[PDB]
Every structure is written in structure tokens, then in C-alpha cells.
Amino acid sequence: AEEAERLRREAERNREKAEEQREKAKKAYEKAKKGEASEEHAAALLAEAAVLELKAVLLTLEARRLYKELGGDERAREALEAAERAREAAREAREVAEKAYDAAS
Amino acid sequence: EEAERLRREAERNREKAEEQREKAKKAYEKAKKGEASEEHAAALLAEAAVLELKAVLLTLEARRLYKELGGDERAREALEAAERAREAAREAREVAEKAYDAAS
Amino acid sequence: AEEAERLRREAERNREKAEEQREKAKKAYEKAKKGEASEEHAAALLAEAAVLELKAVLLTLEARRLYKELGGDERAREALEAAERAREAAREAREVAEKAYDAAS
């Protein structure tokens, strides 16, 4: 009940951190500075994006367990939906960070 | 039909919400630069709240159609679409709230 | 199945390219008010933005077909969602490129 709502809110905060990471990775690509400092920075965006994706994966697993216990409660469905959207956003952020990293090298 | 109409209205609502949250996040990030318009953020908040309410009403319409068709697969799909639209618009409004408060 | 993952990835690359093009066009629009913007560059940005928008129309059509064939599978839902984000990003890119071209002339 309240747990599905807390999970939903957690997934939403994960998703907004991912969108911030994607924007940083985009700016890093647009500003193809080249050099070690730019490579190291692009590596950090890559690493933070991958952490966000796995965290959203864990939230998805949690939402899928809660979704079974609550027998399909709309609150559990909406939390499961937020978790999948967060994973999609973090995976998209990683993909952009990859592009920025491969370009800085 | 009517189930497929509801489904498409829900898909459209969900897409507008995705557009609105992007605008709201743009305004929120700009609000850390100090040049964000409160009035613009107020308009984003107003539109996000409209979409979340429209989604809630679609959900209720879909639930009504679900019991009427006795659990039709199409009816179930319209309901699920309405619930995704609602969650997308709710998240949109949260970002718009943060954008408004930061711009004030 | 694997096609939906492929569609999602292509749509995510489109959306990212459209955001980069939007930034390029915004710089051109600002450089038009200093008079320094070239009409040829703005026309080139407009053509590239329109190509992205055509590719976005194609992806949404393809993701729609896949969504029907896959029966609302989560992977086909994500491909259609990314395609819609690509379509909106390409639209904004083209709108800004039009402003940059109209200002440069």
C-alpha cells in the first residue's frame, strides 16, 4: 500500500537522476574536448549511468514482488511502471555516456 | 471500439505528459541559473495538472468499460494504458512543481 | 523481440542526434543576431533536422507494427516510447533550425 507508493517515488527519483546523467553525457559529447581529463570525465558518466541502471533493475525486481503480493493493485502496477521507466532512462543515459567516452578517446 | 478509442486517448495523454516533463525539467535546470520565469513555470504546472486529471478520468472511464465488457482483453488494455498515462502525468506534475518552487 | 531492442536503440540514437542538432541550431540562431550566421549552414541544419524527423516517423510506424505483433510486450512498448521521444526531439530540432534559417536570411 504505502510501500508501493514509496517504491514509486524512489523509482521516479532514480529516473530524474538518469535524465540528469544523460544531459551531462550529451554536453560532454558536444564539447569534444579530447585528452585524459575529458576521457576520465566521460568514464565517470559511464560509471554513474551503469550504477543507475542496476539500481533501477533492483527496484523493478522489488516492484514485481510487490505486484504479485498485492495481486495487481494499481498502486503496485504504477510502481512497477515507474521502475521500468527509470531503467529505460538510465540505460539511455549509459548509451549516451558510451558515445561521449568513445568520442573522447 | 470505445475500448480502442480509450486506449488511443490514453496513449496521447501519456505522450503529452512525456513532453511536459521535459519542458518542466528544462525549466527546473534553468531555475538553478537564476533566470527562470515563475509565470512560465506556473503554466507548465497548470498543464501538467490538467493532464493528470484527464488521465484519472480516463482511468475511471476505462474501469467502467472493463466491468461492462466482463474483462475483455481490449478493455483490460485500455485500462492499463490509462494507468500508465496517469503515472506519466503525475511524474510530469512533480517535475513542474519543482520547477515552479525553484523559480520562486 | 530482438527487433524491438534494435528499434529502441535506433530511436535512442535518433533522439540523441536530434538534441545535438538542436544545440547546433540554437548557436546558429544566436549567431544570426550578431549577423555572423551563414545562410548555407542554417539551411544545412534544417535539412539534417528534417531527415531526423523523417527517420522518426519511420521508427514510430515500425514500432507500431511491432507493438501489434508482439501484443504489448514491454520491449515493444519501450521501442514505441523511444520512437515517440525521437519524434519530438527531431521536431524541436527542426523548429529551431527554421528560426535560425529565417533569421540568417
Numbering used by the authors:
A (entry chain A), C (entry chain C): 0 to 104
B (entry chain B): 1 to 104
How do the authors describe this structure?
We set out to design proteins that can switch between two well-defined and fully structured conformations. We reasoned that these goals could be collectively achieved with a “hinge”-like design in which two rigid domains move relative to each other while remaining individually folded. The hinge amplifies small local structural and chemical changes to achieve large global changes while the chemical environment for most residues remains similar throughout the conformational change, avoiding the need for global unfolding. Designing one of the resulting conformations to bind to a target effector couples the conformational equilibrium with target binding.
To explore whether peptide-responsive hinges could be turned into protein-responsive hinges, we used inpainting with RoseTTAFold to add two additional helices to a validated effector peptide, resulting in fully structured 3-helix bundles (3hb). For nine of our validated hinges we designed and experimentally characterized these effector proteins using SEC. Hinge-3hb binding was tested qualitatively by SEC and, for hinges which had a corresponding FRET construct, quantitatively with the FRET-labeled variant, and DEER was used in addition to FRET to confirm that 3hb binding caused the same conformational change as effector peptide binding. For two designs, 3hb05 and 3hb12, we obtained crystal structures that agreed well with the design models, indicating that the three-helix bundles are fully structured in isolation. The affinity of 3hb05 to cs074F was similar to the affinity observed for the original peptide cs074B, whereas 3hb21 bound its target hinge cs221F significantly tighter than the original peptide cs221B. The 3hb approach was able to rescue designs for which the peptide alone or the hinge-peptide complex had shown the tendency to form higher-order oligomers.
